[PDB]
Design a protein around this ligand. Structure first.
Ligand code: CLA
Ligand code: CLA
Ligand code: CLA
Ligand code: CLA
Ligand code: CLA
Ligand code: CLA
Ligand SMILES: C=Cc1c(C)c2cc3nc(c4c5[nH]c(cc6nc(cc1[nH]2)C(C)=C6CC)c(C)c5C(=O)[C@@H]4C(=O)OC)[C@@H](CCC(=O)OC/C=C(\C)CCC[C@H](C)CCC[C@H](C)CCCC(C)C)[C@@H]3C
Ligand SMILES: CC(C)=CCC/C(C)=C\CC/C(C)=C\CC/C(C)=C\CC/C(C)=C\CC/C(C)=C\CC/C(C)=C\CC/C(C)=C\CC/C(C)=C\CC1=CC(=O)C(C)=C(C)C1=O
Ligand SMILES: CC1=C(/C=C/C(C)=C/C=C/C(C)=C/C=C/C=C(C)/C=C/C=C(C)/C=C/C2=C(C)CCCC2(C)C)C(C)(C)CCC1
Ligand SMILES: CC1=C(/C=C/C(C)=C/C=C/C(C)=C/C=C/C=C(C)/C=C/C=C(C)/C=C/C2=C(C)CCCC2(C)C)C(C)(C)CCC1
Ligand SMILES: CC1=C(/C=C/C(C)=C/C=C/C(C)=C/C=C/C=C(C)/C=C/C=C(C)/C=C/C2=C(C)CCCC2(C)C)C(C)(C)CCC1
Ligand code: OEC
Ligand SMILES: [Fe+3]
Lengths: 333, 76, 31, 339, 37, 33, 421, 30, 38, 38
């Protein structure tokens, strides 16, 4: 009998949120991550990323400012293994081998995953379509790609992606010096998806703003809104479709509102869809292009193509990434 | 364009003979070698003067022209 | 102290949350 | 004779050629041809040392139109420029193209915002779009003019190509640590925020569309009288409110805010660059550096990065900057053990 | 006191405040390190 | 209907050069050394 | 152009389509097998060219000697042909059933082939296809025990095709693999070391499939099952859809970390193989320069070559410390209690071991789209991309999109039940 | 560590002025 | 539906396939030069 | 710490049975706003 009274609670509106079966995991999970994570950033002790005995400490108390960094990746020794708290000894240990990293990550992904489920489930209790579930799927998938797949493809969570601002940058740099991304279509479409969204989110909102109902209670001293009850909605779509059409050409402009908003959710999502793949594909070593040589068979004199000066920089960095943690000549992972 | 000349035969007729006439006109632009001399884009024969391990550079703002020539006389 | 200041400005950004999400002005159809 | 032209000219045809139509098309055309021409036919190794076009066989990516030689400073070497002396072929050998493209192309951008103003006073719409467009134009001048001006010459300006741009990126990371600049950070904020909006807005709509609006149940219809449009703000609201926690529901704000994020961002980013033009950067944290030298058992990501940079700089500057003629002996180069 | 060339009513709402502060603090956060260091 | 600036010029101004290049480029792909 | 969605209910046409795409899958099987034995050159590392099925065919130890490319050429031509013709045998079928006429009104037919929303008939159709897998699975068993063996990469010498005897049929062992941590080296299904486990692990499936195929045949789903699941046609795709995704992942990760199943000899060396291979390659090199491996002290103080693992054994040091879980036929003989024996190392190290290290170490799975071999910085004069990176890469991709599919079609089954249709 | 103490005053005023500012206006509003 | 009507699904296929031949080239061509790289 | 490991698993599985048994649930099942089929 009780069991029935509980479910009804979870299922409908609670005057704050909606916490369905999906948030039954999402809420306790994302909490453990938050708390742990906030504290790790304010006091975590140094952590030696690559097994080496050279601890890096990117926490507030240990001499950092916000940009300087945060929660550092597990050791390269525990690298790919499961490192819970119970599994170790003293926390002085745990804290050194990157525990916080794993703990925070895994809870976050799981609850991150469920935050997505929750999005759909709310749709089922409100009779609306299931799309928002899909558009979130892009970044989520990406987080996983960066936080999981790679360390899974590489052989150790260490060098997953630090939880600091600064290290984000590091991960990036090291990354293209090791796999050369810039020249990979999936990260190229990525810049397309993003620079896309920028150009469109500006375009739409720009036009939507220019073709407004010029005459609705808007004077030069006041500006007050609309509300669903408002039939004609805010703008004269004929003015916008007319505007844009006259700036380039008829086809160029969009006739109806579906093709407009569908585009807005299509471009970005399918751009990151790919990028998130990009990484996941270079997680197992299928690195970007690399046109290192173009010649003059005349003598075979090598001619440097713009791309070689790209390899000249990619080079300097390879050489010094993870200084003194290499004992053999060629990195293989 | 709803397909306007896109359907008629005149459009194909006047281009079937026009477009493949530029397609070729261009091709011969490269086979003949005008590109190189009109644009001055050295050919594999002329990058390095055999055993001239240096890269032609440009230094003087006013002698660009006489400089460049100094480089073409060399290769010859 | 370089610290408390990054913390201080932190607690506010969370205090602002609570207050924004739980004490916001109503979105009503009374219109 | 005037007004007539006004009309003939401003006559509503397929491709609107307004008063601005005169700047825009001659410039935006040549700026395109200028690229495509050199891209396919010119070499820039007399001026840069690398391979510029397809004529030498670069892939699309590799091919580009390279910047003039550093020996020339900011002399706009136009065809009749005292330096090219009217000889086209050389005017190209020297890179007189870059200047071409940037100048004509600068005006095409001028024309395009002008054409955006015209159309708004003929149709009677708001000028807003023309204003949103300033961001890119800022970014453009910021990048391709201001920056090269502040520095040694035209050479250091981005190169007109694909890879030639990636190399730009990296260049910046090594000598400027542009990523640490806060301005690029905000810029990085709006661009990613533009795409975040573009998804939620577009998905929310599409998914909150009115039920049964089409029996067949696909969604390819509308009309003018369809005043109410195809979806609910009331449901979205509650949707968000209960999932994310917040949701200002007032369509007019939603769209404007969508102007603010992207555009507000690029202006910063452009500002950030007017700064680097003067080698004025955010490449250091005195506080850290200090304790970084008095103590060797202390390291943060801040540091690890500054190391990569020097690697970028040492290895990449002698091939990347032919004019100083850097000679760097193997030993000298910074280098982690075993690699 | 007796002039009418001015529309004398200034308003900011609850919501506008939230976004206002959200910006100043976040903004402050970021820059904090730079002023400091 | 007639020939006109808009329809006419626009198209050939962009569209004609292209095949000249595509023609030139097509020639490139076979070159040696 | 949801064309394929108009077909939803006219099962008479789906058969026409399902059996049409079912014809492509087999077509590819021939077009690729023949394309391979085409480009294929004998005695050159299968994987240094760019093959994928043949390696499968030699996996089943269909045509090979102790880790020797192929002694018998032919075995592949059989496969190339068969599947290429099965593509017509079905192309005919798919086309016909697609164009000659719909279904469901044939009385004797509806008795043999029913429709949707009918739990008892869907169930029955399901079990059917289950009786088929129960078989194919068991056939694999046949091909290892009473037929031309299977390729065991383990003990001894070269591990050519060998026939198995009394597969690990213990009830415990088989599901133990299911109950083990999917972390650090131990992935439930991937942990499979002994080839005999694999055989026995197939016997149980078939018995389980069949025992199930028949089960639903005779039984219609219970209440709990009825009130949890929906029954729309689109919804059964959502079930099946997401199932395949998981697996895409499954196999992908399964691909990168080899179990005897994927003998690294055809497929290439494992991501870790290469690293661990590079450590061993250099112990020897310096060992030949008279370097003492036990007292080595790398700039870190961890000894260049030998260090420990958290549980205290010996492992090659260097970043390759994260792959001490790695196990293969070459590195094992030096393995013993407590980890690697410092005494077998410098005393009992045969030459053929340096070879494998060098080869693998040399063909690191690392590659780019230009097929450039090695580090992102190498020169374009070396072409290679470990099959594994190809399988892992492409297949990951599909397992992802496909999941996007589990969301799209399953969320649309919520619109049928009452939502938007 | 070594930090320029003027940052504090800078970073505190950044927090207050614009904030105070807006605080004054949200009261006149009501 | 060909009563002798002026084609379009043909034009759509002619160029479409034509383009594939030019690009296809562009790939072949990308082989003739990098191929002597060393 | 072994005491900790145990405590966790209880907690975790606890909330699992609430996910699982929350769906198979004969009571709430699959109840929507537009149509209840029971
Ligand atoms: C100022 C000129 C300029 C130009 C023209 C480009 C152009 C480009 N850049 Mg570069 N870039 C520039 C400056 C420039 N950049 C600067 C200053 C920097 C900083 C140093 C960069 C940094 C940069 C990076 C880091 C990257 C690029 C990339 C790219 C490519 C991106 C493709 C894309 O999706 O874009 C976004 C735009 C869109 C998605 C839309 C453009 C509009 C199209 C053409 C409309 C098509 C519509 C059709 C005609 C009509 C249909 C009608 C409809 C109704 C049906 C593109 C070739 C990316 C790449 O992939 O490189 C190869 C990449 O990764 N750029
Ligand atoms: C199990 C297999 C499967 C099946 C049988 C279906 C079946 C169906 N889907 Mg679903 N789908 C699937 C998986 C599947 N899907 C997956 C994994 C995803 C996630 C990506 C989707 C996403 C999806 C969406 C988003 C939609 C559908 C829709 C539909 C219906 C579409 C009818 C149609 O218009 O097709 C037309 C199909 C196409 C034009 C195919 C485009 C394919 C890409 C662009 C090709 C890429 C190839 C590339 C060129 C190759 C390069 C070469 C390589 C060597 C490198 C149909 C019921 C539609 C619907 O409304 O459902 C009712 C719809 O909108 N599906
Ligand atoms: C995965 C592959 C695939 C498959 C199997 C189908 C299958 C089908 N589609 Mg879909 N379709 C697909 C992809 C696919 N489609 C994609 C990607 C799109 C988006 C572009 C569409 C868009 C679409 C639309 C818009 C429509 C369909 C329709 C149909 C049905 C047509 C039945 C018919 O008789 O047509 C007529 C048949 C022909 C013209 C004959 C084709 C003959 C083939 C090529 C012969 C091959 C040779 C043969 C094997 C030789 C055997 C010889 C022997 C000796 C061995 C059919 C079930 C239609 C429908 O309404 O269905 C309900 C419809 O209107 N489809
Ligand atoms: C996925 C696997 C698959 C499946 C499940 C099926 C399933 C089926 N197939 Mg298909 N098939 C497949 C693959 C598959 N096929 C492939 C790959 C091929 C190509 C090799 C074929 C080729 C194929 C053919 C060629 C035929 C089938 C038929 C059938 C149906 C047979 C049932 C039966 O009892 O027939 C037993 C047969 C009968 C009861 C025949 C009765 C004869 C009719 C009524 C005569 C009408 C003539 C009359 C004198 C006219 C008077 C007119 C007046 C104006 C003079 C069944 C639905 C048959 C069918 O659909 O026909 C009923 C059929 O003829 N299949
Ligand atoms: C082809 C695949 C297949 C499919 C789609 C189904 C589908 C179904 N089965 Mg059937 N089943 C199968 C194979 C299959 N079964 C086999 C091979 C057997 C023999 C053991 C059975 C035995 C069986 C029984 C005894 C019963 C069902 C029941 C059901 C229904 C259960 C409702 C439900 O899912 O509740 C929710 C589901 C769960 C709580 C289970 C989740 C399990 C996960 C996803 C899979 C774990 C798989 C395993 C670890 C992998 C093997 C690894 C290998 C290395 C050994 C459903 C229609 C019930 C029924 O229809 O009642 C009359 C029922 O009582 N099935
Ligand atoms: C070929 C066999 C194989 C397969 C199929 C997998 C599969 C998987 N691996 Mg494993 N792996 C393998 C071999 C394999 N691995 C080997 C040999 C190694 C040795 C190095 C590893 C090392 C490894 C690591 C280091 C990691 C993985 C992870 C993962 C998971 C990633 C997807 C995800 O985010 O799920 C999210 C979860 C689900 C979709 C749940 C499916 C189960 C049912 C249907 C739902 C239960 C619902 C409830 C809410 C959750 C309870 C979960 C419980 C743990 C608390 C996936 C299940 C990652 C992970 O997240 O660990 C588990 C990870 O970090 N693997
Ligand atoms: C990848 C980067 C990016 C590109 C390529 C891009 C492109 C474009 N944006 C336009 C518009 C806009 N973009 C907008 C906001 C944004 N646009 C953004 C980012 C981009 N926008 C971002 C981030 C925003 C947010 C602020 C707005 C608000 C608008 C418009 O209103 C307008 C439009 O109508 O929308 C579609 C179109 C203007 C055409 C024109 O004025 O020609 C005139 C000038 C020309 C042709 C050349 C000037 C010369 C320059 C220097 C040369 C460029 C030549 C290249 C180097 C050569 C080709 C290179 C290849 C690699 C592609 C053009 C398609
Ligand atoms: C016909 C036909 C087949 C043409 C083919 C064209 C072609 C192959 C071009 C290739 C390359 C290219 C871009 C060349 C450029 C030449 C040149 C000088 C071009 C101007 C190009 C240009 C400005 C293009 C823009 C293309 C375009 C219309 C993109 C969509 C933008 C978008 C989604 C806006 C949002 C939006 C649109 C509306 O319409 C309304 C109303 C509202 C509200 C709204 O938000
Ligand atoms: C310099 C000069 C001049 C002239 C010139 C010009 C103006 C030019 C132009 C030119 C041009 C204008 C050219 C072009 C070319 C082109 C090309 C060669 C193209 C190609 C393309 C393609 C191949 C495409 C494709 C695709 C696909 C397939 C898919 C995806 C998408 C796309 C679309 C990308 C004059 C006398 C005035 C004076 C000054 C100087
Ligand atoms: C798109 C589409 C579709 C589909 C289709 C399909 C599905 C198809 C299929 C097809 C198929 C499935 C096919 C197959 C084929 C095959 C063939 C054609 C074969 C051939 C062969 C031969 C010829 C042989 C070979 C050989 C041998 C064996 C030996 C040695 C030598 C040689 C090489 C000669 C449909 C209708 C639905 C609808 C519309 C659209
Ligand atoms: C609509 C459209 C379009 C177009 C299209 C096109 C242009 C297409 C084409 C297509 C095509 C052009 C296709 C083709 C296909 C083909 C196929 C699919 C074939 C097959 C074959 C087979 C299967 C064969 C077999 C055999 C035989 C019979 C004999 C012996 C030998 C062999 C085996 C070889 C575009 C994109 C613009 C855009 C959108 C729209
Ligand atoms: Mn984090 O990292 Ca994948 O590259 Mn080589 O191995 Mn270790 O050195 Mn860097
Ligand atoms: Fe909108």
């Amino acid at each position: 009998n009780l069991w029935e009274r509980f479910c009804n609670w979870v299922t409908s509106t609670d005057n704050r949120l909606y916490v369905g079966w999906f948030g039954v995991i999402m809420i306790p999970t994302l909490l453990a991550a938050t708390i742990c994570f906030v504290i790790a950033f304010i006091a975590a002790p140094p952590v030696d990323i690559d097994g080496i005995r050279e601890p890096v400490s990117g926490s507030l108390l240990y001499g950092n400012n916000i940009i300087t960094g945060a929660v550092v990746p597990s050791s390269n020794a525990i690298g790919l293994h499961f490192y819970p708290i119970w599994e170790a000894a003293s926390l002085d240990e745990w804290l050194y081998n990157g525990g916080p990293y794993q703990l925070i990550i895994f809870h976050f992904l799981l609850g991150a995953s469920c935050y997505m489920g929750r999005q759909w489930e709310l749709s089922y209790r409100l009779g609306m379509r299931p799309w928002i579930c899909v558009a979130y799927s892009a970044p989520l998938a990406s987080a996983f790609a960066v936080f999981l797949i790679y360390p899974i493809g590489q052989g150790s969570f260490s060098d997953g992606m630090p939880l600091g601002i600064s290290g984000t940058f590091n991960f990036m740099i090291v990354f293209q010096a090791e796999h050369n991304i810039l020249m990979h279509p999936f990260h190229q479409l990525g810049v397309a998806g993003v620079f896309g969204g920028a150009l469109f989110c500006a375009m739409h909102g720009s036009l939507v703003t220019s073709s407004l109902i010029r005459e609705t209670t808007e004077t030069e001293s006041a500006n007050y809104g609309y509300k669903f009850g408002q039939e004609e909605e805010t703008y004269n779509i004929v003015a916008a479709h007319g505007y844009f059409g006259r700036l380039i050409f008829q086809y160029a402009s969009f006739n109806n509102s579906r093709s407009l908003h569908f585009f807005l959710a299509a471009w970005p999502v399918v751009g990151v869809w790919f990028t998130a793949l990009g990484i996941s594909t270079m997680a197992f070593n299928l690195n970007g292009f690399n046109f290192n040589h173009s010649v003059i068979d005349a003598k075979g004199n090598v001619i440097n193509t713009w791309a070689d000066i790209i390899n000249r920089a990619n080079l300097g960095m390879e050489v010094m990434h993870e200084r003194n943690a290499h004992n053999f000549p060629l990195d293989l992972a | 364009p709803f397909s306007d000349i896109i359907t008629s035969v005149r459009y194909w007729v006047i281009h079937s003979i026009t477009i493949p006439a530029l397609f070729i006109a261009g091709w011969l632009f490269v086979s003949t070698g005008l590109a190189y001399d009109v644009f001055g884009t050295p050919r594999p024969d002329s990058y390095y003067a055999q055993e001239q391990r240096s890269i032609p550079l440009v230094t003087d703002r006013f002698e660009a022209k006489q400089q460049v020539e100094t480089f073409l006389e060399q290769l010859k | 102290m370089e610290t408390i200041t990054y913390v201080f400005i932190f607690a506010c950004i969370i205090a602002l949350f609570f207050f924004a999400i739980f004490f916001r002005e109503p979105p009503r159809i009374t219109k | 004779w005037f007004d007539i032209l006004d009309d003939w000219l401003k006559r509503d045809r397929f491709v609107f050629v307004g008063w601005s139509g005169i700047l825009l098309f001659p410039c935006a055309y040549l700026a395109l041809g200028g690229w495509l021409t050199g891209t396919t036919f010119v070499t820039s190794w007399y001026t840069h040392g690398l391979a510029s076009s397809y004529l030498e066989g670069c892939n699309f990516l590799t091919v580009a139109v390279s910047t003039p030689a550093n020996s020339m400073g900011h002399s706009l070497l136009l065809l009749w420029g005292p330096e090219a002396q009217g000889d086209f072929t050389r005017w190209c050998q020297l890179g007189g193209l870059w200047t071409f493209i940037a100048l004509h192309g600068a005006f095409g951008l001028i024309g395009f915002m002008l054409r955006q103003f015209e159309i708004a006073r003929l149709v009677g719409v708001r000028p807003y779009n023309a204003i949103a467009f300033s961001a890119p134009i800022a970014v453009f001048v910021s990048v391709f003019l201001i920056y090269p001006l502040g520095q040694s010459s035209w050479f250091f300006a981005p190169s007109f190509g694909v890879a030639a741009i990636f190399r730009f990126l990296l260049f910046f990371q090594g000598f400027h640590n542009w990523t640490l600049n806060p301005f690029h950070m905000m810029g990085v904020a709006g661009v990613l925020g533009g795409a975040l909006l573009c998804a939620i807005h577009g998905a929310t709509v599409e998914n909150t569309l009115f039920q049964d609006g089409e029996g067949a149940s696909t969604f390819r219809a509308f009309n003018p009288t369809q005043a109410e449009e195809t979806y609910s703000m009331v449901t979205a609201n509650r949707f968000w409110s209960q999932i994310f926690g917040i949701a200002f529901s007032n369509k007019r704000w939603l769209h404007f805010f969508m102007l603010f994020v992207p555009v507000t961002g690029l202006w910063m980013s452009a500002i950030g660059v007017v700064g680097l033009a003067l080698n004025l950067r955010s490449y250091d944290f005195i506080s850290q550096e200090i304790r970084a030298a008095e103590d060797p058992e202390f390291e943060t990501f801040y540091t690890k990065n500054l190391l990569l940079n020097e690697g970028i700089r040492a290895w990449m500057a002698p091939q990347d900057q032919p004019h100083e003629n850097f000679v760097f002996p193997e030993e000298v180069l910074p280098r982690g053990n075993a690699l | 006191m007796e002039p009418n060339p001015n529309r004398q009513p200034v308003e900011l709402n609850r919501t506008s405040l939230y976004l206002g502060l959200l910006l100043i603090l976040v903004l402050a956060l970021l820059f904090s390190s730079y002023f400091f260091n | 209907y007639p020939i006109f600036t808009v329809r006419w010029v626009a198209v050939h101004t962009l569209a004609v050069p292209t095949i000249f290049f595509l023609g030139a480029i097509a020639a490139m792909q076979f070159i040696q050394r | 152009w949801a064309g394929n969605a108009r077909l939803i209910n006219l099962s008479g046409k789906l058969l026409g389509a399902h059996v049409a795409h079912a014809g492509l899958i087999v077509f590819w099987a021939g077009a690729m097998t023949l394309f391979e034995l085409a480009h294929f050159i004998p005695e050159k590392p299968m994987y240094e060219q760019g093959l994928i099925l043949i390696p499968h065919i030699a996996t089943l130890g269909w045509g090979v000697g102790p880790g020797g490319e192929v002694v018998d050429t032919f075995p592949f031509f059989v496969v190339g042909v068969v599947h290429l013709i099965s593509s017509a045998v079905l192309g005919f079928g798919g086309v016909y059933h697609a164009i000659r006429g719909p279904e469901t009104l044939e009385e004797y037919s509806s008795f043999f082939g029913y429709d949707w929303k009918d739990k008892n008939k869907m169930t029955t159709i399901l079990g059917f296809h289950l009786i088929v897998l129960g078989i194919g699975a068991l056939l694999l068993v046949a091909k290892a025990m009473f037929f031309g063996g299977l390729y065991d990469t383990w003990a001894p010498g070269g591990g050519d095709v060998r026939v198995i005897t009394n597969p690990t049929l213990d009830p415990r062992v088989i599901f133990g693999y299911l109950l083990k941590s999917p972390f650090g080296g131990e992935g439930w299904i991937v942990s499979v070391n002994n080839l005999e486990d694999v055989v026995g692990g197939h016997i149980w499936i078939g018995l389980i499939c069949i025992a199930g195929g028949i089960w639903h045949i005779l039984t219609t789903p219970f209440g709990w099952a009825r009130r949890a699941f929906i029954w729309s046609g689109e919804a059964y795709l959502s079930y099946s859809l997401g199932a395949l995704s998981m697996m895409g992942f499954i196999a992908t990760c399964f691909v990168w970390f080899n179990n005897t199943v994927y003998p690294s000899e055809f497929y290439g060396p494992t991501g870790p193989e290469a690293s661990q291979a590079q450590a061993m390659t250099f112990l020897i090199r310096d060992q030949k320069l008279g370097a003492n491996v036990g007292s080595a002290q790398g700039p870190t103080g961890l000894g260049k070559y030998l260090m420990r693992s958290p549980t205290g054994e010996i492992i090659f040091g260097g970043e390759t410390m994260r792959f001490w879980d790695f196990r293969g036929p070459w590195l094992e003989p030096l393995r013993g209690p407590n980890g690697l024996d410092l005494n077998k190392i410098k005393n009992d190290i045969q030459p053929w071991q340096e070879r494998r290290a060098a080869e693998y170490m040399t063909h690191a799975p690392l590659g780019s789209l230009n097929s450039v071999g090695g580090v992102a910085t190498e020169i374009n004069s070396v072409n290679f991309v470990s099959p594994r990176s190809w399988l892992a890469t492409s297949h990951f991709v599909l397992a992802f999109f496909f999941l996007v599919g589990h969301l799209w079609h399953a969320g649309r089954a919520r619109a049928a039940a009452a939502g938007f249709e | 560590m070594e930090v320029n103490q003027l940052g504090l005053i800078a970073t505190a005023l950044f927090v207050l002025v614009p904030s105070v500012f807006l605080i004054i206006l949200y009261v006149q509003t009501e | 539906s060909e009563g002798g009507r002026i084609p379009l699904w043909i034009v759509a296929t002619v160029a479409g396939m034509g383009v594939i031949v030019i690009v296809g080239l562009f790939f072949y061509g990308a082989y003739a030069g990098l191929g002597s790289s060393l | 710490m072994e005491t900790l490991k145990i405590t966790v698993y209880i907690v975790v599985t606890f909330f699992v049975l609430l996910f699982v048994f929350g769906f198979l649930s004969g009571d709430p099942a699959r109840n929507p706003k537009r149509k209840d089929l029971e």
